Amino acid sequence: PLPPLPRELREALYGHRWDRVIVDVRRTHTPVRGRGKREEYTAMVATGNMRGVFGLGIGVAESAQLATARAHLDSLSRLAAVPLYRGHTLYTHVDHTFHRLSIRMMPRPAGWGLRCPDLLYELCGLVGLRDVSIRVRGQRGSRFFVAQCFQEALQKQTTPHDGVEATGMYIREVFR
RNA sequence: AAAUUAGAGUUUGGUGCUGGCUCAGCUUUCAUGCGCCGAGCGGUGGUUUAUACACAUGCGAGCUUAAGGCCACGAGUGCGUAAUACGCGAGUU
């Protein structure tokens, strides 16, 4: 089989910096009419550029290298952009729930460090979150749902630069 | 110049739930093995944790002009007490 790569993505791999993280690789099972038990390796690859554009890719195949390569290229096909404060923290408090998992995410002032669970440490270093305290609640037994949940939870927040043109009201003085 | 939330493994042919068990965290013992006991300056800590069990012996309240004058402060334990207790807040005959 052959995985796809476009033309205009080939200004980006020559463009931004990039890092790659496999989320988890999982072996599923199916007993099938005719020959027996067919398995697929499902692989989940995250890819960011450490400046606030994040990507996820889920891939399914028969063997582990081909599965991780498919999810590797699927993530690099699928990128979404996430606003940060100066590349280290998120704008608001963030709460979200994918499948039924209660993530709770807070901003922290820069130089707090990442106080953060296992895979989400590489995830926040991937997209570029240097200073965030998180906790995940509910059944945390799946890596895939915390990855997808984290992508949507990043996409939830609100940006202040879409106001100053049209609110008549200037937005500055960040002194605590 | 206000200093502020870590999970993972475990259940099933697999997936997700459902809550439980465990490990990684910090603190804690004259704990129990195995090993050193070089020497000094120190902090500190033992509620002999328990027995409010039985105490050998020695010492802990004597001072002072026979006689008289002053020795209810210090130390220990938590039996009893669920409220004249203890804490907090007002006023006192």
Summed up, what is this model?
The protein is of the alpha+beta class. It has helices at 64-77, 118-127, 143-155; strands at 19-32, 36-48, 53-61, 79-81, 94-98, 101-107, 132-137.
Describe the model:
With 176 residues, the protein is of the alpha+beta class. Helices cover 21% and strands 32% of the residues. The chain contains three helices and seven strands; from the N terminus they run βββαβββαβα. The strands form two sheets. The chain has a four-stranded antiparallel sheet, with helices on both faces. The chain has a three-stranded antiparallel sheet with strand order 5-6-7, with helices on one face. A hairpin with a 3-residue loop joins β1 (19-32) and β2. The chain binds one RNA strand of 93 nucleotides through residues 26-31, 37, 39, 99-100, 104, 106, 108-109, 112, 114-121, 133-136, 138-142, 145, 176. The PDB classes it as ribosome.
Relevant terms:
RNA-binding, 176 residues, 3-stranded antiparallel sheet, 4-stranded antiparallel sheet, 1 chains
Sequence-ordered SSE layout with sheet pairings:
Layout: E1 19-32, E2 36-48, E3 53-61, H1 64-77, E4 79-81, E5 94-98, E6 101-107, H2 118-127, E7 132-137, H3 143-155
Antiparallel strand pairs: 1-2, 2-3, 3-4, 5-6, 6-7
The chain binds one RNA strand of 93 nucleotides through strand 1, helix 2 and strand 7.
